[PDB]
């Protein structure tokens, strides 16, 4: 039975930190990841996880309609010869890794402009 949507997911394949070379890499796929949540339903929290071996990144939205565009925008892209995929997490499971995100409200911008 396939995971019902929740606010929450796990990003694979964002990145591979082996090859990873410009400086500041991680930085600017918080910012493209935000840009690309904020032309959908935004984003509370995220953390691309620089030690991640399948390029992971953690993203939380306001709500699971607003989770379900964000997956569905960037379930879509390649990189590197591998297909980014998404994984829904349960609420208590991503807050738990992540307690900051629990009370969360505030969307999120990118940095650069």
């Avoid at 990145?15 to 930085?27: A, H, I, L, S």
């Avoid at 953390?47 to 309609?65: E, F, L």
């Avoid at 607003?66 to 998404?86: D, E, P, Q, S």
């Amino acid at each position: 039975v396939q995971p019902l949507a929740t606010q929450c997911f796990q990003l694979s394949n964002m990145f591979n930190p082996q090859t990873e070379e410009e400086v500041g890499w991680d930085t600017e796929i918080k910012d493209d990841v935000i840009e690309e949540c904020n032309k959908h339903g935004g984003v509370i929290h995220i953390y691309v996880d620089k030690n991640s071996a399948q390029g992971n990144v953690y993203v939380k939205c306001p709500s699971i309609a607003a989770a379900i565009a964000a997956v569905n925008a960037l379930h879509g892209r390649w990189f590197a010869g591998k297909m980014i995929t998404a994984a829904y997490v349960p609420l208590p499971t991503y807050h738990n890794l992540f307690p900051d995100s629990m009370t969360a409200t505030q969307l999120l911008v990118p940095s650069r402009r």
